[PDB]
């Protein structure tokens, strides 16, 4: 049975814990990969965690200088939900230093980019059989979401970036069926910057919230349908979401708000409910520490700084990182609504602490329409390890 | 459903990455076998990696002097594609120091040779049940392909060698059904030398490219049908393929071209497309370092040294080794043609570096008719290990 279309998001009041890895706490004595950018994707029968490995084990001699991302040794693998990414639990998926993957009900589609900096190549597989390839069109680092793609009515949709990291770039939407590309569209967004988009299905369209590394401290959004016609804009609230960001103030949803702290950013997410918005953001204005979920009842049509409730995930004394959004659909649960969920990455090592490596673990939450609570679920490892001395 | 016959090889423009193990990088702290000669074989539902183990773990006291091949401890095992050959991931297949194995759609046939140097015995199993045995007929080391066999229309075909390694030898073709030998034929090839043949299905026949260890620096080929009638010859191009080899010059396809560097060789492969040929060869003329794929549009009917395009797999500063060919068929993909693929072994340890052991990892590529790129995918281990000091 394939993931149909037309069902709206589902009414919620809070977020309930779903999973925790405890990966770096176990990698102190066990065999655990050195991973980063872990995302979660669900299909008709199970939910899995995909991650990008550096090709080395934690607490080893080969984990030296693993702060660098592009190398011929990274691979994309996957394991069941909530289980430590061990060599004995993980299933090989693809060869890549940038990747994404979703499901269309029965099977798995994966996209993985590898190659030199100037002529990188993306390989598209469906159930382990190579079905397509795409090549860079601007001669600069070509990269993708690092979170799940959206697959509805047998068609899967992704967005791909190419070009400079501090100027105008160039963007494509890809529409894929059963593993091979059937269409693509060039997004004309003069004055924008889309990177690392998080996408979810709403109504009969796809809704994505992306990141700006050139001059924005709020987040840009794109919305498109199955004919690849797009609307673009910025989140219109005054409660900024990027990192680093200035103090809360006047927002704008026709263009970026810089205020001196636009350059750079982190992967993030927001969920739209009519006129309101749920914004996921870190607690510190300069570093990646803490994490909270803010509910703004006018966040999509108004530029004020006032909000209507805050629930906290990680306190201000602990490290966070990337965050992303996924969905659990009515073919699994049995409802007529789509359940929204999110995941958070937690980074340990360089550049902020005194080690030779860098790794990350994850936690995952799902939205519910009932009583919930706010607490702190940090990483909890005691660094440095044995190899660092 | 059984793999049928009659379908030709697919049109191709380049090669796209399929899998990487990262086995020696993980064996530095994890539990990984000491393997060598790893090949890949695919069936109707999955692709697996078969390998020959020395019976010891890497970074152990028992891995001392594992450069020697024939011993009562080697075994043939298999694991899923792209996964480290761990004791917790591997499935026992057979007892052998030389072996091969294919699939005929539903199941697995394996052949494994074991015993003394003069009275070795090959055991044939189908799904783990011993169905046949064969015994050496010339009283000298009896050996087989170390890559997959070709199984079409329920019948499986192999080629087996016996005799001296620097003089005339003796060759048989074996035709097997459901695990037991139904026919065999004696190849009369006065002046030839076939070892470690790589075979693929073309048309209604089987096409194999072999290795010459007596006086050839090009590669010999054999072609046969289901009645075991054979044509034999040499690859007719002037771009030589074996290591060691002389500088490129005038080739010949009626006999071997020695030019001083015939003695010795490595396992290799070539794919034939009408009049042209894809040749897989190493970059260094004396050692086993580097690897590239050369396309020669007259390589099967002309003796000139000119080509039409080169794509590189491993650069000249890194170690390579054996290489082999396999196929993915239209019962899996769904097309009307067979997709050709190849794999490369990467050897670390003695005789070239300062350790007490020898092991190898693998990479695998498949052919596609679209945009691709050339890069380097080396091994990446940092030798020597702890046990070597």
């Amino acid at each position, epitope marked *: 049975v394939h993931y149909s279309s037309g069902r709206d998001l589902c009414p919620i009041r809070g977020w309930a814990p779903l999973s925790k890895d405890n990966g770096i706490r176990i990698g102190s004595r066990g065999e655990v990969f050195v991973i980063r950018e872990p995302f979660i994707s669900c299909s008709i029968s199970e939910c899995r965690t995909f991650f990008l490995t550096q090709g080395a084990l934690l607490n080893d001699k080969h984990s030296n200088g693993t*702060v*660098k*991302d*592009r190398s011929p040794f990274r691979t994309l693998m996957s394991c069941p939900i909530g289980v430590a990414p061990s060599p004995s639990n993980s299933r090989f998926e693809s060869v890549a230093w940038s990747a994404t993957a979703c499901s269309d009900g029965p099977g798995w589609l994966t996209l993985g980019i590898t190659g030199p900096d*100037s002529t990188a190549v993306a390989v598209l597989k469906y159930n382990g059989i190579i079905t397509d390839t795409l090549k860079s069109w601007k001669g600069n680092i070509m*990269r993708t979401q690092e979170s799940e793609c959206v697959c509805q009515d047998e068609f899967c949709y992704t967005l791909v970036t190419d070009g400079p*990291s501090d100027a105008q770039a160039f963007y494509k939407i890809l529409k894929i069926r059963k593993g091979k590309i059937v269409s693509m569209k060039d997004v004309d967004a003069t004055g924008f910057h889309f990177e690392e988009c998080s996408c979810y299905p709403s109504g009969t369209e796809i809704e994505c919230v992306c990141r700006d590394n050139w001059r924005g401290s709020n987040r840009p959004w794109i919305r498109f349908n199955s004919d690849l016609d797009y609307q673009i804009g910025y989140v219109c609230s005054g409660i900024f979401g990027d990192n680093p960001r200035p103090v809360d103030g006047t927002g704008s949803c026709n263009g970026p708000v810089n205020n001196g702290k636009g350059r750079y950013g982190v992967k993030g997410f927001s969920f739209r409910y009519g006129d309101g918005v749920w914004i996921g953001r870190t607690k510190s204005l300069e570093s990646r520490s803490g994490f909270e979920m803010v509910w703004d009842a006018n966040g999509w049509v108004s530029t004020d700084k006032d909000s209507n409730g805050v629930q906290d995930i990680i306190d201000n004394d602990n490290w966070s990182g990337y965050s992303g959004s996924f969905s659990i659909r009515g073919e699994t649960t049995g409802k007529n609504c789509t359940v929204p969920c999110f995941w958070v990455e937690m980074i340990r090592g360089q550049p902020k602490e005194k080690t*030779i490596w860098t790794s990350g673990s994850s936690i995952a939450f799902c939205g519910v329409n009932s009583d919930t609570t706010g607490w702190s679920w940090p990483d909890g490892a005691l660094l440095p390890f044995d190899i660092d001395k | 459903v059984h793999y049928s016959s009659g379908r030709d090889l697919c049109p191709i423009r380049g090669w796209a990455p399929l899998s990487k193990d990262n086995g020696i990088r993980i064996g530095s702290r994890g539990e990984v076998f000491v393997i060598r000669e790893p090949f890949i074989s695919c069936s109707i539902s999955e692709c697996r990696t078969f390998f020959l183990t020395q019976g010891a773990l890497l970074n152990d006291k028992h891995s001392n002097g594992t450069v020697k091949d024939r011993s009562p401890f080697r075994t043939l095992m298999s694991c899923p594609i792209g996964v480290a050959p761990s004791p917790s991931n591997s499935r026992f297949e057979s007892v052998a120091w030389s072996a091969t194995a294919c699939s005929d759609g539903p199941g697995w046939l394996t052949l494994g040779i074991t015993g003394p140097d003069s009275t070795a015995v090959a055991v044939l199993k189908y799904n783990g049940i011993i169905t046949d045995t064969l015994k050496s007929w010339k009283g000298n080391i009896m050996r087989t392909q170390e890559s997959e066999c070709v199984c079409q229309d329920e019948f499986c075909y192999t080629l087996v060698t016996d005799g001296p390694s620097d003089a005339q030898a003796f060759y048989k073709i074996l035709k097997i059904r459901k695990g037991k030998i139904v026919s065999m034929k004696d190849v009369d090839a006065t002046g030839f030398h076939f070892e470690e043949c790589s075979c693929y299905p073309s048309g209604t026949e089987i096409e194999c490219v072999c290795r010459d260890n007596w006086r050839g620096s090009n590669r010999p080929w054999i072609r046969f049908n289901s009645d075991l009638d054979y044509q034999i010859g040499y690859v007719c191009s002037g771009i030589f393929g074996d290591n060691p080899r002389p500088v490129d010059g005038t080739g010949s396809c009626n006999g071997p071209v020695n030019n001083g560097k015939g003695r010795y060789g490595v396992k290799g492969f070539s794919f034939r497309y009408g009049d042209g040929v894809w040749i897989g060869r190493t970059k260094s003329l004396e050692s086993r370092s580097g690897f590239e794929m050369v396309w020669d549009a007259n390589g099967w009917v002309s003796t000139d040294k000119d080509s039409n395009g080169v794509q590189d797999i491993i*650069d000249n*500063d890194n170690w390579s080794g054996y290489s082999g060919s396999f196929s993915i068929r239209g019962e899996t993909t769904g097309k009307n043609c067979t997709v050709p693929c190849f794999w490369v072994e990467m050897i670390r340890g003695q005789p070239k570096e300062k350790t007490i052991w020898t092991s190898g990892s693998s990479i695998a590529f498949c052919g596609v008719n679209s945009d691709t790129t050339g890069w380097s995918w080396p091994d990446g281990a940092l030798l020597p290990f702890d046990i070597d000091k």
Partner: antibody, heavy 123, light 107 residues
Framework: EVQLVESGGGLVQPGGSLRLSCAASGFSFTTYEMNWVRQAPGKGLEWVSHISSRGLVIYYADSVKGRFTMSRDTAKNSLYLQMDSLTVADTAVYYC????????????????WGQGTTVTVSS | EVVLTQSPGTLSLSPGERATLSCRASQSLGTNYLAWYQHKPGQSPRLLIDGASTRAIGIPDRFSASGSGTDFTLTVSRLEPEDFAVYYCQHYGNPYTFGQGTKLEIK
């Protein structure tokens, strides 16, 4: 064993030309960014030229503009500096240095240097 | 342009006490792209401090750097007789510049 080795230094009469080379081992030029730096006799370091991991020559120092051409070759892992119309103000020691660009943090810093080669211009 | 002025010009100290070297710009840096290098005669330079706070891998613990805005400071906690060299502050943001250096000799 990551390393860089310079070659091509020597003595040149004013108005001449030279061609310096830097040969690398242990890594690839298809992922890293390269630099030519120099030290004058008795003076501090001066940044001469920067080349990216994908070819673009991002920067040339104002003093060496129009007379120096930076280039590379990835098939041999070599870097070349072609210098023409030399002045007595170019006597120095030259180093090739390496650094990186990350797409999440960005532009780490020069952590690998070559041993350097010497050039003199006089009569 | 960012002209990095490095002070003091010359430093004399005994082995065992604490040293501070200051590097100050002319117009404010918009980033944290400032690194500290150590150069000893007869050798190629060595990276010490990266990103104005993070430390390079394999470097002793007596070195630590910090600063912000227009003012940056490198400190050596306890001098050891092998730590006498020239020290350079470099700005690899925009525009590319080097300092003139501070020389640390023995009392």
């Amino acid at each position: 064993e990551v390393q860089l080795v310079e070659s091509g230094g020597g003595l040149v009469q004013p108005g001449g030309s030279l061609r310096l080379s830097c040969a690398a081992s242990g890594f690839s030029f298809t992922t890293y960014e390269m630099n030519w730096v120099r030290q004058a006799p008795g003076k501090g370091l001066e940044w001469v030229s920067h080349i990216s991991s994908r070819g673009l020559v991002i920067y040339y120092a104002d003093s060496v503009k129009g007379r120096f051409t930076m280039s590379r070759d990835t098939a041999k892992n070599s870097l070349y500096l072609q210098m023409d119309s030399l002045t007595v103000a170019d006597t120095a020691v030259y180093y090739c240095a390496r650094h990186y660009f990350d797409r999440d943090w960005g532009y780490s810093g020069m952590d690998l240097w070559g041993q350097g080669t010497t050039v003199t211009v006089s009569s | 342009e960012v002209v990095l002025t490095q002070s003091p010009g010359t430093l004399s100290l005994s082995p065992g006490e604490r040293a501070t070297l200051s590097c100050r710009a002319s117009q404010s840096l918009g980033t944290n792209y400032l690194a500290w290098y150590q150069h000893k005669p007869g050798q190629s330079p060595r990276l010490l401090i990266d990103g104005a706070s993070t430390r390079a891998i394999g470097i002793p613990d007596r070195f630590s750097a910090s600063g912000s805005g227009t003012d940056f400071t490198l400190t050596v906690s306890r001098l050891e007789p092998e730590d006498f060299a020239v020290y350079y502050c470099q700005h690899y943001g925009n525009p590319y510049t080097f300092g003139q250096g501070t020389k640390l000799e023995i009392k």
